[PDB]
C-alpha cells in the first residue's frame, strides 16, 4: 500500500492523477483509446491491492459508472475488462448500478458467443499489457467470464427473455471447459408455473438438448437441465419423436456402468447413475413410447442378477433402478413370476417408505 504512505493533499492528488485522467473524457477519445486506458487501469488493479482498496473506499461508484458507461457485446476486449472490473470491485448486491450490466443486451449475448480474439491490435506496449493481464485473469474470454458474472452477481428472482433457448443452443453447439455454470443458469431460468409461451420455449430447448452426444449426456449439469425441462409433461408431448433416441443413449450408459448399480464407492458414478435414472424415470413414467421400449430390454438381465444376489442393504441407485425397471416392464408387457414380483413389490414399498418419486412408486405399485 503506497496509499498508506500518503500524508498530504498534494501526494494524494498525485497518487490518483492517472485515475483521474483515465476517468476523464480525454482518455475516451476513441473506442481503442478507451480500451487501452481501461486496460492499464485493470492491469494496475490486478498488480496493486492498495489501488483497489483506494477505489472501493473513495472512488467506487465513480469508477463503476465510468467502466459501464457504455457496454457492447461485440467489443470483445473491452467487455472482458468490464467483466474483470465487476468481479474485482463488485458493488454491494443491493446497489442499483448493477443494472448498468444489462442481462438482455450485454450479458446474455456475451455468455453465448464463443468467438474471442487471440491478439489485440495496437502498439507493442498495449500488446504486452494485454498478454500480461490475460495470464492473471480468472477467465480469458468473455463467454466464460459473462456466465460467471451472470451466475455470481446477477441471478435475480426473475427469468430473462430468450435465455432458455439461447443457453440450450450454447450447450448443444458449444464446447466449454465446464458445463456446470451454463446449465445452472438454464435450470434457474425454468419457472415452476409456466405460461404456454414459456412452455414452447422449454419445448424448443428440450428438443435442442434431446439430441446431444453420448458424451455431453454424461455431464451432471446437462442431465439436471433435462430433468427440470421434462418435469413439465407438455414438453414430452411436444417432443415425442426424440424420446426413443434419448432413452436409448440413457439405457446404454446405464448398461455401461451397470456393475455400479448395486454398490458404488465412486461419487461421480453414483451421481451419474442417479441423474440418468431420474431422467429415464421422467420419460418412461409419462411416455409409453413404442420405439424406446426395446433398448430398456437389457434392464431385465440386471434385475435378474440382483434377484439372485439380493444385496444386504439397498442403495438409493438400486431403488431408483428398480423403480425404472418396473415402468419399463409394464411398457414391454413383461410378466414377472411370483418370487420376482414379490421381491420387486417389497423393495418398492420400502422405497416408498424412505423420506416426485413417491407418487411414481405409488402408481407402479398398482401394476403389481
Amino acid at each position: 500500500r503506497h496509499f498508506n504512505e500518503l500524508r498530504t493533499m498534494g501526494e494524494t492528488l498525485k497518487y490518483s492523477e492517472d485515475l483521474d485522467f483515465i476517468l476523464s473524457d480525454n482518455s475516451m477519445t476513441t473506442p481503442e483509446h478507451r480500451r487501452n486506458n481501461m486496460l492499464r487501469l485493470c492491469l494496475d488493479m490486478m498488480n496493486n491491492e492498495d489501488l483497489c482498496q483506494y477505489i472501493v473506499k473513495y472512488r467506487h461508484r465513480e469508477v463503476w459508472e465510468w467502466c459501464f458507461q457504455g457496454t457492447d457485446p461485440k467489443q470483445k476486449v473491452t467487455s472482458l475488462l468490464q467483466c474483470f472490473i465487476a468481479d474485482k470491485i463488485p458493488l454491494l448486491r443491493h446497489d442499483k448500478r448493477w443494472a448498468m450490466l444489462s442481462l438482455e443486451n450485454f450479458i446474455l449475448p456475451l455468455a453465448t458467443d464463443e468467438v474471442f480474439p487471440k491478439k489485440i491490435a495496437g502498439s507493442r506496449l498495449v500488446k504486452l499489457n494485454y498478454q500480461d493481464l490475460l495470464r492473471k485473469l480468472k477467465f480469458t474470454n468473455t463467454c466464460e467470464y459473462a456466465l460467471y458474472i451472470w451466475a455470481t452477481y446477477l441471478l435475480y428472482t426473475e427469468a430473462v427473455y430468450g435465455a432458455v433457448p439461447a443457453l440450450a443452443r450454447l450447450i448443444s453447439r458449444g464446447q466449454l471447459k465446464d458445463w456446470d455454470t451454463a446449465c445452472s443458469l438454464l435450470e434457474n431460468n425454468i419457472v415452476a408455473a409456466p405460461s404456454g409461451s414459456d412452455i414452447e420455449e422449454y419445448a424448443q430447448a428440450f428438443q435442442t438438448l434431446a439430441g446431444l452426444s453420448r458424451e455431453k449426456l454424461t455431464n451432471e449439469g446437462v442431465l439436471k437441465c433435462l430433468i427440470k425441462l421434462t418435469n413439465h409433461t407438455t414438453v414430452l408431448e411436444l417432443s415425442a419423436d426424440l424420446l426413443p433416441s434419448l432413452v436409448r443413449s440413457l439405457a446404454m450408459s446405464v448398461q455401461l456402468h451397470q456393475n455400479n448399480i448395486v454398490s458404488s464407492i465412486s461419487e461421480i458414478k453414483t451421481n451419474l447413475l442417479i441423474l440418468q435414472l431420474g431422467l429415464l424415470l421422467n420419460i418412461v413414467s409419462e411416455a409409453t413410447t413404442a420405439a424406446s421400449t426395446e433398448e430398456l430390454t437389457n434392464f431385465g438381465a440386471v434385475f435378474r442378477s440382483v434377484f439372485v444376489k439380493k444385496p444386504t442393504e439397498m442403495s438409493f441407485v438400486l431403488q431408483l433402478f428398480l423403480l425404472v425397471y418396473a415402468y419399463s416392464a409394464g411398457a414391454a408387457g413383461v410378466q414377472l413370476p411370483p418370487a420376482e414380483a414379490d421381491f420387486l413389490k417389497s423393495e418398492l414399498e420400502a422405497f416408498a417408505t424412505d423420506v416426485n418419486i413417491h407418487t411414481r412408486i405409488t402408481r407402479v405399485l398398482e401394476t403389481l
Side-chain angles (χ1 to χ4, degrees):
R1 290 187 283 190
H2 192 228
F3 176 75
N4 59 51
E5 290 174 74
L6 322 152
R7 281 261 297 179
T8 61
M9 111 88 203
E11 290 175 326
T12 303
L13 214 125
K14 200 81 181 195
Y15 177 84
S16 73
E17 201 157 76
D18 186 33
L19 185 50
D20 285 345
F21 170 68
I22 292 178
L23 302 181
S24 60
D25 306 323
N26 297 292
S27 76
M28 269 144 56
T29 307
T30 208
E32 191 191 79
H33 294 149
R34 154 157 160 93
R35 161 182 76 54
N36 293 357
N37 284 321
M38 185 177 303
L39 174 68
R40 185 170 71 263
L41 181 53
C42 290
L43 175 65
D44 293 337
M45 298 164 59
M46 179 67 82
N47 295 333
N48 297 258
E49 190 54 29
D50 70 318
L51 169 64
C52 308
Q53 285 162 260
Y54 160 76
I55 283 153
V56 163
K57 179 173 209 297
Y58 301 112
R59 315 292 298 274
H60 209 168
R61 292 178 177 162
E62 197 186 346
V63 176
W64 193 270
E65 290 181 311
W66 177 83
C67 293
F68 300 101
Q69 87 174 119
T71 62
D72 182 342
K74 303 192 205 159
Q75 292 269 240
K76 288 293 173 56
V77 175
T78 291
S79 302
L80 189 66
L81 306 162
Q82 287 169 322
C83 282
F84 170 76
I85 292 296
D87 191 28
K88 181 60 157 180
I89 49 169
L91 296 175
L92 291 166
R93 293 171 183 264
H94 47 85
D95 191 311
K96 56 182 152 92
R97 289 165 193 83
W98 272 113
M100 307 182 70
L101 288 72
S102 162
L103 284 157
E104 294 170 295
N105 309 169
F106 177 58
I107 298 290
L108 168 54
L110 278 179
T112 61
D113 182 8
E114 304 197 78
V115 185
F116 198 77
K118 296 205 172 279
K119 53 170 187 158
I120 199 183
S123 16
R124 194 228 318 157
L125 192 271
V126 170
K127 293 170 153 295
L128 217 279
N129 274 357
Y130 185 66
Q131 291 305 321
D132 223 304
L133 183 57
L134 283 194
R135 302 194 268 266
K136 310 297 290 273
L137 294 181
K138 215 170 271 179
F139 307 94
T140 52
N141 60 84
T142 195
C143 166
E144 281 177 86
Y145 230 144
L147 294 159
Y148 174 92
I149 294 304
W150 186 353
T152 303
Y153 300 105
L154 313 165
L155 203 67
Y156 309 119
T157 85
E158 198 61 41
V160 13
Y161 178 66
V164 174
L167 287 164
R169 283 198 299 286
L170 175 72
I171 294 158
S172 87
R173 300 198 190 156
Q175 209 185 73
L176 285 171
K177 285 189 190 287
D178 193 23
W179 288 113
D180 304 315
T181 306
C183 294
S184 184
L185 289 157
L186 190 165
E187 217 198 328
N188 295 340
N189 272 269
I190 291 161
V191 305
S195 81
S197 61
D198 278 348
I199 284 160
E200 293 289 328
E201 262 164 87
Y202 302 167
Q204 162 174 60
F206 174 70
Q207 275 153 33
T208 302
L209 294 153
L212 279 168
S213 56
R214 291 186 170 142
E215 202 64 51
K216 286 198 202 176
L217 294 168
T218 61
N219 191 265
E220 285 187 17
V222 169
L223 289 169
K224 280 169 203 168
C225 290
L226 287 174
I227 284 169
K228 209 175 171 189
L229 284 158
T230 54
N231 286 340
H232 307 275
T233 45
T234 314
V235 168
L236 298 155
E237 291 167 34
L238 288 153
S239 321
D241 287 321
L242 285 338
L243 294 190
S245 160
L246 176 60
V247 175
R248 188 188 147 84
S249 302
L250 293 172
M252 287 169 78
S253 172
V254 175
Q255 186 183 339
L256 185 60
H257 304 281
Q258 63 185 30
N259 287 340
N260 292 261
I261 293 158
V262 169
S263 177
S264 174
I265 61 174
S266 178
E267 195 195 353
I268 197 154
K269 285 200 179 187
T270 292
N271 283 337
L272 178 62
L273 285 171
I274 286 169
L275 294 169
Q276 291 184 319
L277 291 160
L279 180 54
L280 280 166
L281 178 64
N282 270 8
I283 301 167
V284 303
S285 68
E286 300 290 322
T288 314
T289 44
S292 73
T293 307
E294 274 192 40
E295 340 292 328
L296 286 182
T297 278
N298 196 252
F299 278 30
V302 179
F303 170 75
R304 281 185 299 277
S305 297
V306 173
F307 176 66
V308 164
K309 287 309 188 299
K310 293 178 191 48
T312 165
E313 304 131 50
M314 298 277 306
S315 61
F316 182 66
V317 161
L318 178 59
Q319 294 174 314
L320 221 50
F321 170 82
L322 298 172
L323 174 57
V324 170
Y325 173 70
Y327 279 95
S328 75
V334 158
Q335 304 259 95
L336 281 66
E340 308 190 359
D342 292 335
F343 168 69
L344 180 56
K345 183 176 167 160
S346 55
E347 290 315 320
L348 287 176
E349 295 171 357
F351 187 27
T353 64
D354 286 35
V355 59
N356 214 5
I357 297 178
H358 191 268
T359 291
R360 268 135 176 200
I361 307 173
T362 304
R363 185 149 71 82
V364 263
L365 281 170
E366 293 176 352
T367 65
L368 282 159

